[PDB]
Tab-separated table of C-alpha atoms in Angstrom:
chain	number	residue	atom	x	y	z
A	1	UNK	CA	51.026	-19.870	-83.116
A	2	UNK	CA	52.433	-19.953	-79.754
A	3	UNK	CA	53.424	-23.040	-77.533
A	4	UNK	CA	54.209	-22.912	-73.757
A	5	UNK	CA	55.076	-25.819	-71.775
A	6	UNK	CA	55.951	-25.734	-68.042
A	7	UNK	CA	57.241	-28.828	-66.600
A	8	UNK	CA	58.941	-30.386	-63.442
A	9	UNK	CA	61.011	-32.354	-65.527
A	10	UNK	CA	64.784	-31.213	-65.262
A	11	UNK	CA	66.237	-29.031	-68.053
A	12	UNK	CA	68.773	-31.793	-68.465
A	13	UNK	CA	66.001	-33.982	-69.754
A	14	UNK	CA	64.940	-31.728	-72.418
A	15	UNK	CA	66.335	-33.229	-75.735
A	16	UNK	CA	68.417	-30.980	-77.898
A	17	UNK	CA	66.332	-30.175	-80.807
A	18	UNK	CA	63.073	-30.382	-79.032
A	19	UNK	CA	62.161	-26.727	-79.733
A	20	UNK	CA	62.656	-27.441	-83.339
A	21	UNK	CA	60.486	-30.624	-83.398
A	22	UNK	CA	57.867	-28.759	-81.585
A	23	UNK	CA	58.146	-25.820	-84.267
A	24	UNK	CA	57.925	-28.269	-87.073
A	25	UNK	CA	55.306	-30.449	-85.924
A	26	UNK	CA	53.010	-27.425	-84.832
A	27	UNK	CA	53.612	-25.933	-88.197
A	28	UNK	CA	52.271	-28.914	-90.069
A	29	UNK	CA	49.584	-29.321	-87.507
A	30	UNK	CA	48.249	-25.844	-87.755
A	31	UNK	CA	48.924	-25.267	-91.339
A	32	UNK	CA	51.242	-22.097	-90.775
A	33	UNK	CA	54.649	-21.327	-91.967
A	34	UNK	CA	57.201	-22.409	-89.282
A	35	UNK	CA	58.185	-18.729	-89.229
A	36	UNK	CA	55.119	-17.887	-87.451
A	37	UNK	CA	55.585	-20.346	-84.705
A	38	UNK	CA	56.916	-19.695	-81.447
A	39	UNK	CA	57.638	-22.168	-78.666
A	40	UNK	CA	58.767	-21.839	-75.023
A	41	UNK	CA	59.851	-24.654	-72.813
A	42	UNK	CA	60.169	-23.971	-69.015
A	43	UNK	CA	61.562	-26.960	-67.125
A	44	UNK	CA	62.704	-27.562	-63.385
A	45	UNK	CA	59.218	-25.982	-62.318
A	46	UNK	CA	57.827	-26.418	-58.887
A	47	UNK	CA	54.637	-28.214	-59.688
A	48	UNK	CA	52.163	-30.884	-58.639
A	49	UNK	CA	49.172	-32.780	-60.918
A	50	UNK	CA	46.786	-34.382	-58.846
A	51	UNK	CA	48.646	-33.601	-55.771
A	52	UNK	CA	51.653	-35.752	-56.870
A	53	UNK	CA	55.151	-34.453	-58.040
A	54	UNK	CA	55.424	-37.272	-60.681
A	55	UNK	CA	56.360	-35.657	-64.115
A	56	UNK	CA	53.789	-33.531	-65.318
A	57	UNK	CA	53.234	-30.328	-67.804
A	58	UNK	CA	50.661	-27.502	-67.924
A	59	UNK	CA	50.970	-26.124	-71.449
A	60	UNK	CA	48.929	-23.654	-73.557
A	61	UNK	CA	48.568	-23.134	-77.277
A	62	UNK	CA	47.613	-19.647	-78.771
A	63	UNK	CA	46.673	-19.266	-82.199
A	64	UNK	CA	44.624	-16.579	-84.453
A	65	UNK	CA	42.267	-19.210	-85.706
A	66	UNK	CA	43.020	-22.934	-86.242
A	67	UNK	CA	41.659	-23.550	-82.722
A	68	UNK	CA	38.326	-25.723	-82.686
A	69	UNK	CA	36.795	-28.837	-81.308
A	70	UNK	CA	38.246	-31.309	-83.544
A	71	UNK	CA	41.254	-29.506	-84.070
A	72	UNK	CA	42.009	-29.119	-80.489
A	73	UNK	CA	41.303	-32.952	-80.082
A	74	UNK	CA	44.086	-33.791	-82.514
A	75	UNK	CA	46.550	-31.045	-81.240
A	76	UNK	CA	46.220	-33.051	-77.753
A	77	UNK	CA	47.202	-36.340	-79.423
A	78	UNK	CA	50.006	-34.678	-81.256
A	79	UNK	CA	51.385	-32.925	-78.170
A	80	UNK	CA	50.887	-35.583	-75.596
A	81	UNK	CA	52.635	-37.712	-78.072
A	82	UNK	CA	55.610	-35.473	-78.098
A	83	UNK	CA	55.601	-34.753	-74.234
A	84	UNK	CA	55.272	-38.654	-73.454
A	85	UNK	CA	58.105	-39.605	-76.046
A	86	UNK	CA	60.668	-36.783	-75.682
A	87	UNK	CA	60.044	-35.863	-71.741
A	88	UNK	CA	58.661	-39.200	-70.621
A	89	UNK	CA	55.576	-37.190	-69.324
A	90	UNK	CA	52.382	-39.503	-68.843
A	91	UNK	CA	49.761	-38.189	-71.198
A	92	UNK	CA	47.261	-38.101	-68.091
A	93	UNK	CA	49.608	-35.652	-66.309
A	94	UNK	CA	49.440	-33.013	-68.958
A	95	UNK	CA	46.607	-30.128	-69.493
A	96	UNK	CA	46.842	-27.790	-72.534
A	97	UNK	CA	44.769	-24.866	-72.694
A	98	UNK	CA	43.853	-23.492	-76.069
A	99	UNK	CA	43.270	-19.947	-77.083
A	100	UNK	CA	41.803	-18.698	-80.214
A	101	UNK	CA	43.085	-15.204	-80.285
A	102	UNK	CA	41.645	-12.343	-82.068
A	103	UNK	CA	43.883	-10.846	-84.550
A	104	UNK	CA	43.390	-7.018	-82.773
A	105	UNK	CA	44.683	-8.795	-79.874
A	106	UNK	CA	47.932	-10.110	-81.156
A	107	UNK	CA	50.551	-7.403	-81.212
A	108	UNK	CA	53.728	-8.263	-83.397
A	109	UNK	CA	56.230	-6.015	-84.858
A	110	UNK	CA	54.989	-2.439	-83.823
A	111	UNK	CA	51.444	-3.253	-84.540
A	112	UNK	CA	48.783	-5.940	-84.494
A	113	UNK	CA	47.349	-8.415	-87.046
A	114	UNK	CA	44.022	-6.735	-87.395
B	1	UNK	CA	41.561	-26.839	-61.998
B	2	UNK	CA	44.794	-25.185	-62.477
B	3	UNK	CA	46.366	-22.759	-60.333
B	4	UNK	CA	49.635	-20.742	-60.965
B	5	UNK	CA	51.486	-18.438	-58.748
B	6	UNK	CA	54.346	-16.167	-60.002
B	7	UNK	CA	56.043	-14.203	-57.312
B	8	UNK	CA	59.213	-12.436	-56.425
B	9	UNK	CA	59.445	-14.196	-52.826
B	10	UNK	CA	62.541	-16.455	-52.728
B	11	UNK	CA	62.026	-20.109	-53.372
B	12	UNK	CA	63.588	-20.749	-49.947
B	13	UNK	CA	60.344	-18.879	-48.352
B	14	UNK	CA	57.974	-21.522	-50.261
B	15	UNK	CA	57.033	-23.717	-47.470
B	16	UNK	CA	57.204	-27.386	-48.131
B	17	UNK	CA	53.718	-28.720	-48.652
B	18	UNK	CA	52.430	-25.359	-50.346
B	19	UNK	CA	51.869	-27.266	-53.325
B	20	UNK	CA	49.601	-30.098	-51.445
B	21	UNK	CA	48.052	-27.445	-49.164
B	22	UNK	CA	46.919	-25.469	-52.427
B	23	UNK	CA	45.802	-28.643	-54.075
B	24	UNK	CA	43.616	-29.735	-51.091
B	25	UNK	CA	42.072	-26.092	-50.200
B	26	UNK	CA	41.349	-25.639	-54.197
B	27	UNK	CA	39.794	-29.065	-54.492
B	28	UNK	CA	37.304	-28.450	-51.611
B	29	UNK	CA	36.651	-24.706	-52.891
B	30	UNK	CA	36.089	-25.900	-56.121
B	31	UNK	CA	34.107	-29.154	-55.432
B	32	UNK	CA	36.525	-31.051	-57.700
B	33	UNK	CA	38.512	-34.354	-56.672
B	34	UNK	CA	42.225	-33.161	-55.885
B	35	UNK	CA	43.413	-35.415	-58.619
B	36	UNK	CA	42.071	-33.032	-61.031
B	37	UNK	CA	43.860	-29.885	-59.429
B	38	UNK	CA	47.265	-28.853	-60.800
B	39	UNK	CA	49.151	-26.454	-59.219
B	40	UNK	CA	52.345	-24.272	-60.225
B	41	UNK	CA	54.663	-22.221	-57.958
B	42	UNK	CA	57.042	-19.895	-59.652
B	43	UNK	CA	59.434	-18.109	-57.063
B	44	UNK	CA	62.443	-15.661	-57.535
B	45	UNK	CA	60.601	-13.758	-60.073
B	46	UNK	CA	61.734	-10.116	-61.387
B	47	UNK	CA	58.708	-8.516	-60.578
B	48	UNK	CA	56.863	-5.074	-59.450
B	49	UNK	CA	53.604	-4.392	-58.599
B	50	UNK	CA	52.582	-0.477	-58.301
B	51	UNK	CA	56.288	0.182	-58.992
B	52	UNK	CA	57.196	-1.532	-55.829
B	53	UNK	CA	59.457	-4.535	-55.224
B	54	UNK	CA	57.989	-5.621	-52.152
B	55	UNK	CA	56.535	-9.185	-52.137
B	56	UNK	CA	53.747	-9.565	-54.805
B	57	UNK	CA	52.045	-12.216	-56.743
B	58	UNK	CA	50.420	-12.608	-59.955
B	59	UNK	CA	48.092	-15.720	-60.385
B	60	UNK	CA	45.465	-17.440	-62.557
B	61	UNK	CA	42.879	-19.976	-62.057
B	62	UNK	CA	41.490	-21.934	-64.827
B	63	UNK	CA	38.755	-23.934	-64.589
B	64	UNK	CA	35.852	-25.709	-66.851
B	65	UNK	CA	33.169	-24.158	-65.094
B	66	UNK	CA	33.252	-23.288	-61.173
B	67	UNK	CA	33.985	-19.725	-62.398
B	68	UNK	CA	31.591	-16.834	-61.542
B	69	UNK	CA	31.143	-13.460	-59.670
B	70	UNK	CA	30.474	-15.035	-56.230
B	71	UNK	CA	32.917	-17.862	-56.453
B	72	UNK	CA	35.670	-15.827	-57.648
B	73	UNK	CA	35.117	-13.312	-54.876
B	74	UNK	CA	35.484	-16.218	-52.261
B	75	UNK	CA	38.344	-18.042	-54.259
B	76	UNK	CA	40.095	-14.569	-53.650
B	77	UNK	CA	39.683	-14.495	-50.058
B	78	UNK	CA	40.934	-18.179	-49.699
B	79	UNK	CA	43.907	-17.415	-52.059
B	80	UNK	CA	44.989	-14.339	-50.676
B	81	UNK	CA	44.749	-15.793	-47.083
B	82	UNK	CA	47.137	-18.575	-48.290
B	83	UNK	CA	49.552	-16.175	-50.012
B	84	UNK	CA	49.698	-13.928	-47.021
B	85	UNK	CA	49.989	-16.673	-44.357
B	86	UNK	CA	52.321	-19.059	-46.174
B	87	UNK	CA	54.240	-16.441	-48.304
B	88	UNK	CA	53.905	-13.346	-46.361
B	89	UNK	CA	52.535	-11.407	-49.211
B	90	UNK	CA	50.275	-8.481	-48.669
B	91	UNK	CA	46.796	-9.289	-50.038
B	92	UNK	CA	46.559	-5.795	-51.794
B	93	UNK	CA	49.745	-6.766	-53.740
B	94	UNK	CA	48.071	-9.934	-55.430
B	95	UNK	CA	46.074	-10.099	-58.663
B	96	UNK	CA	44.378	-13.199	-59.475
B	97	UNK	CA	43.092	-13.906	-63.100
B	98	UNK	CA	40.049	-16.246	-63.250
B	99	UNK	CA	39.201	-18.346	-66.475
B	100	UNK	CA	36.126	-20.350	-67.368
B	101	UNK	CA	37.788	-22.529	-69.814
B	102	UNK	CA	35.331	-24.380	-72.370
B	103	UNK	CA	35.720	-28.016	-72.216
B	104	UNK	CA	36.464	-28.364	-75.867
B	105	UNK	CA	39.678	-25.918	-75.107
B	106	UNK	CA	41.033	-28.022	-72.386
B	107	UNK	CA	43.403	-30.734	-73.694
B	108	UNK	CA	44.219	-33.772	-71.446
B	109	UNK	CA	45.421	-37.364	-71.980
B	110	UNK	CA	45.609	-37.282	-75.840
B	111	UNK	CA	42.091	-35.660	-76.353
B	112	UNK	CA	40.076	-33.010	-74.706
B	113	UNK	CA	37.228	-32.752	-72.312
B	114	UNK	CA	34.548	-32.044	-74.848
C	1	UNK	CA	47.314	-3.542	-65.757
C	2	UNK	CA	49.325	-6.423	-66.017
C	3	UNK	CA	52.447	-6.896	-68.248
C	4	UNK	CA	54.411	-10.216	-68.574
C	5	UNK	CA	57.531	-10.456	-70.749
C	6	UNK	CA	59.214	-13.963	-71.550
C	7	UNK	CA	62.405	-13.639	-73.446
C	8	UNK	CA	65.565	-15.697	-74.091
C	9	UNK	CA	67.735	-12.667	-73.443
C	10	UNK	CA	70.034	-13.184	-70.227
C	11	UNK	CA	69.188	-11.531	-67.031
C	12	UNK	CA	72.271	-9.631	-67.152
C	13	UNK	CA	71.052	-7.556	-70.243
C	14	UNK	CA	67.677	-6.647	-68.384
C	15	UNK	CA	68.706	-2.965	-67.741
C	16	UNK	CA	68.092	-1.941	-63.971
C	17	UNK	CA	64.903	0.209	-63.896
C	18	UNK	CA	63.383	-1.694	-66.791
C	19	UNK	CA	60.393	-2.689	-64.381
C	20	UNK	CA	60.046	1.063	-63.214
C	21	UNK	CA	59.860	2.413	-66.934
C	22	UNK	CA	57.713	-0.228	-67.994
C	23	UNK	CA	55.303	0.648	-64.868
C	24	UNK	CA	55.381	4.308	-65.847
C	25	UNK	CA	55.087	4.043	-69.717
C	26	UNK	CA	51.969	1.485	-69.136
C	27	UNK	CA	50.634	3.642	-66.633
C	28	UNK	CA	50.666	6.642	-69.075
C	29	UNK	CA	49.504	4.701	-72.231
C	30	UNK	CA	46.497	2.863	-70.191
C	31	UNK	CA	45.765	6.000	-68.385
C	32	UNK	CA	45.719	4.107	-65.187
C	33	UNK	CA	47.364	4.977	-61.900
C	34	UNK	CA	50.988	3.711	-61.759
C	35	UNK	CA	50.044	1.769	-58.435
C	36	UNK	CA	47.358	-0.444	-60.233
C	37	UNK	CA	50.136	-1.510	-62.956
C	38	UNK	CA	52.114	-4.995	-62.273
C	39	UNK	CA	55.034	-5.961	-64.429
C	40	UNK	CA	56.767	-9.331	-64.835
C	41	UNK	CA	59.935	-9.806	-66.674
C	42	UNK	CA	61.264	-13.547	-67.133
C	43	UNK	CA	64.560	-13.665	-68.804
C	44	UNK	CA	67.054	-16.744	-69.774
C	45	UNK	CA	64.013	-18.449	-71.184
C	46	UNK	CA	64.397	-21.439	-73.643
C	47	UNK	CA	62.761	-20.094	-76.483
C	48	UNK	CA	62.415	-20.022	-80.515
C	49	UNK	CA	60.551	-17.735	-82.738
C	50	UNK	CA	60.174	-18.751	-86.211
C	51	UNK	CA	62.616	-21.618	-85.359
C	52	UNK	CA	65.396	-19.214	-84.581
C	53	UNK	CA	66.921	-18.655	-81.192
C	54	UNK	CA	67.993	-14.967	-81.749
C	55	UNK	CA	66.478	-12.738	-79.251
C	56	UNK	CA	62.694	-12.960	-79.115
C	57	UNK	CA	59.902	-12.227	-76.409
C	58	UNK	CA	56.472	-13.540	-75.806
C	59	UNK	CA	54.413	-10.986	-73.959
C	60	UNK	CA	50.722	-10.457	-72.527
C	61	UNK	CA	48.974	-7.291	-71.413
C	62	UNK	CA	45.852	-7.949	-69.004
C	63	UNK	CA	43.649	-5.045	-68.412
C	64	UNK	CA	39.992	-4.438	-67.125
C	65	UNK	CA	39.047	-2.609	-70.333
C	66	UNK	CA	41.528	-0.138	-71.965
C	67	UNK	CA	41.981	-2.963	-74.652
C	68	UNK	CA	40.902	-2.467	-78.343
C	69	UNK	CA	41.562	-2.295	-81.838
C	70	UNK	CA	43.612	1.040	-82.132
C	71	UNK	CA	44.711	1.052	-78.400
C	72	UNK	CA	46.287	-2.346	-78.970
C	73	UNK	CA	48.196	-1.053	-82.274
C	74	UNK	CA	49.670	1.716	-80.057
C	75	UNK	CA	50.510	-0.490	-77.245
C	76	UNK	CA	52.455	-2.606	-79.780
C	77	UNK	CA	54.574	0.282	-80.970
C	78	UNK	CA	55.178	1.628	-77.452
C	79	UNK	CA	56.079	-2.002	-76.221
C	80	UNK	CA	58.049	-3.257	-79.212
C	81	UNK	CA	59.774	0.056	-78.696
C	82	UNK	CA	61.020	-0.497	-75.291
C	83	UNK	CA	61.956	-4.079	-76.002
C	84	UNK	CA	63.899	-3.213	-79.031
C	85	UNK	CA	65.757	-0.287	-77.156
C	86	UNK	CA	66.283	-1.936	-73.718
C	87	UNK	CA	66.400	-5.568	-74.575
C	88	UNK	CA	67.808	-5.275	-77.879
C	89	UNK	CA	64.876	-7.518	-79.486
C	90	UNK	CA	63.909	-6.910	-83.152
C	91	UNK	CA	60.254	-5.926	-83.205
C	92	UNK	CA	59.412	-8.845	-85.643
C	93	UNK	CA	60.393	-11.194	-82.993
C	94	UNK	CA	57.818	-10.072	-80.430
C	95	UNK	CA	54.252	-11.419	-79.933
C	96	UNK	CA	51.989	-9.728	-77.346
C	97	UNK	CA	48.684	-10.855	-76.463
C	98	UNK	CA	45.984	-8.434	-75.290
C	99	UNK	CA	43.260	-9.455	-72.841
C	100	UNK	CA	40.322	-7.268	-72.011
C	101	UNK	CA	39.745	-8.845	-68.559
C	102	UNK	CA	36.129	-8.737	-67.014
C	103	UNK	CA	36.208	-6.954	-63.761
C	104	UNK	CA	34.095	-10.090	-62.101
C	105	UNK	CA	37.210	-12.099	-63.309
C	106	UNK	CA	40.347	-10.208	-61.686
C	107	UNK	CA	40.705	-11.019	-58.227
C	108	UNK	CA	42.661	-8.386	-55.976
C	109	UNK	CA	42.828	-8.093	-52.198
C	110	UNK	CA	40.115	-10.810	-50.943
C	111	UNK	CA	37.647	-10.023	-53.358
C	112	UNK	CA	37.375	-8.923	-57.393
C	113	UNK	CA	36.667	-5.864	-59.077
C	114	UNK	CA	33.106	-6.608	-59.871
């Protein structure tokens, strides 16, 4: 699983341990070992959501499987919850793109997962 | 709609208001209310296009629908036009990836659009 | 072809010429003229792979065609090889997403490739 977060929130506002919490919560949520989970936080971005510069986030979750209608719906609750509580970003100023990656299309350790 | 721009152009060369102009032009171009449009500009990047370090840009437009052969062709005119005029990037040093997102795959405000 | 690399490795650790080597190796590997190859390196990122902050990388290769089971497998060898040798990132701390882009979905120079 790979979670990326781009946000206008300053680096200083990213709580220590945020990456750890995301790895842990996403591991539970997807049912994958934490060791397979990679997380990326990109703060201080030049962004606008709806033409406003208020705190917002553009994210994406890539996963070989574990992506689907109902699952994505609960990932959004989990993720928006985390972003709201930890980064103080309003849930309606967050977009999360979900990608069900094919194993043959995910390279890792000199090969792919196919 | 979500528009991202990665470019080697310095932050100082990004005109104030560029994010607003993008929001407005993309809203018109896609026929979506400006409030649904999110824009992201990432300057000062370590990039190379064709092996050259001259100003270039790697972009992506994600949209639930409003993506297609003809539409994408005019988006490129609009976007390359804006990048050329506002960031002085030559149109032939710009790649834009278009993504027709499924509503069930776009999370927002604790749920998805499905 | 478009190759992006996000890594926690410091900017100072990115060897001069790395972008050039990537452009050249990817050109050979995909069988495309170097002029069509765009490369992007994003260092100093706040990342975690498996909950660890040791050097890691999250990458993606987008290409109109030239994407497939066997090809992706050798791209991973090539790419992990380069990342390991030039950025000292362990191959098992690298994820590379492969995207076979439809020509109608790749904008360039005021139009698309369709």
